[PDB]
UniProtKB/Swiss-Prot annotation:
UniProt subunit comment: Interacts (fully reduced HMGB1) with CXCL12; probably in a 1:2 ratio involving two molecules of CXCL12, each interacting with one HMG box of HMGB1; inhibited by glycyrrhizin. Associates with the TLR4:LY96 receptor complex. Component of the RAG complex composed of core components RAG1 and RAG2, and associated component HMGB1 or HMGB2. Interacts (in cytoplasm upon starvation) with BECN1; inhibits the interaction of BECN1 and BCL2 leading to promotion of autophagy. Interacts with KPNA1; involved in nuclear import. Interacts with SREBF1, TLR2, TLR4, TLR9, PTPRZ1, APEX1, FEN1, POLB, TERT. (Microbial infection) Interacts with adenovirus protein pVII; this interaction immobilizes HMGB1 on chromatin, thus preventing its release from cell and subsequent inflammation activation.
Role played: Multifunctional redox sensitive protein with various roles in different cellular compartments. In the nucleus is one of the major chromatin-associated non-histone proteins and acts as a DNA chaperone involved in replication, transcription, chromatin remodeling, V(D)J recombination, DNA repair and genome stability. Proposed to be an universal biosensor for nucleic acids. Promotes host inflammatory response to sterile and infectious signals and is involved in the coordination and integration of innate and adaptive immune responses. Nuclear functions are attributed to fully reduced HGMB1. Associates with chromatin and binds DNA with a preference to non-canonical DNA structures such as single-stranded DNA, DNA-containing cruciforms or bent structures, supercoiled DNA and ZDNA. Can bent DNA and enhance DNA flexibility by looping thus providing a mechanism to promote activities on various gene promoters by enhancing transcription factor binding and/or bringing distant regulatory sequences into close proximity. May have an enhancing role in nucleotide excision repair (NER).
Domain of life: Eukaryota
PTM per Swiss-Prot/TrEMBL: Phosphorylated at serine residues. Phosphorylation in both NLS regions is required for cytoplasmic translocation followed by secretion. Acetylated on multiple sites upon stimulation with LPS. Acetylation on lysine residues in the nuclear localization signals (NLS 1 and NLS 2) leads to cytoplasmic localization and subsequent secretion.
Gene: HMGB1
Protein name as annotated: High mobility group protein B1
Induction: (Microbial infection) Protein levels increase upon infection by human coronavirus SARS-CoV-2.
Organism of this sequence: Homo sapiens
Modified residues (Phosphoserine): 2
Protein family: Belongs to the HMGB family.
Note, other: Proposed to contribute to the pathogenesis of various chronic inflammatory and autoimmune diseases, and cancer. High serum levels are found in several inflammatory events including sepsis, rheumatoid arthritis, artherosclerosis chronic kidney disease, systemic lupus erythematosus (SLE). Seems to be implicated in other diseases characterized by cell death and damage, including diabetes and Alzheimer's disease. Its nucleosome-associated release during secondary necrosis may play a role in SLE.
Annotated tissue distribution: Ubiquitous. Expressed in platelets.
Residues the record lists as Cysteine sulfonic acid (-SO3H) modifications: 8
Entry's free-text remark on domains: HMG box 2 mediates pro-inflammatory cytokine-stimulating activity and binding to TLR4. However, not involved in mediating immunogenic activity in the context of apoptosis-induced immune tolerance.
Length: 36
DNA sequence: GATCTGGCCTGTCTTACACAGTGATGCAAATCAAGTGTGAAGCCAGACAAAAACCCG
């Protein structure tokens, strides 16, 4: 486990509520994680 | 005529030299640690009908 893995496991429901479908969801997650 | 001597011939060590090994490093690269999230396949229950080869009348 790493910081990115923890952030993903913590904010996956965010992308879930945002878009159902997870290419674009994971892309946006990685983008916002690299931004923050 | 009787030895004395310089120059090849050739079987000798003798000696350097590259290679094969042992071990360990050490970077380039393929794969995986988990996160969902679909998304396309594989097979099975329900009962009903088409190609291909060998033997008999």
């Amino acid at each position: 486990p790493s910081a990115f893995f923890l952030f993903c496991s913590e904010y996956r429901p965010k992308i879930k509520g945002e878009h159902p479908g997870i290419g674009d969801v994971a892309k946006k997650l990685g983008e916002m994680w690299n931004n923050t």
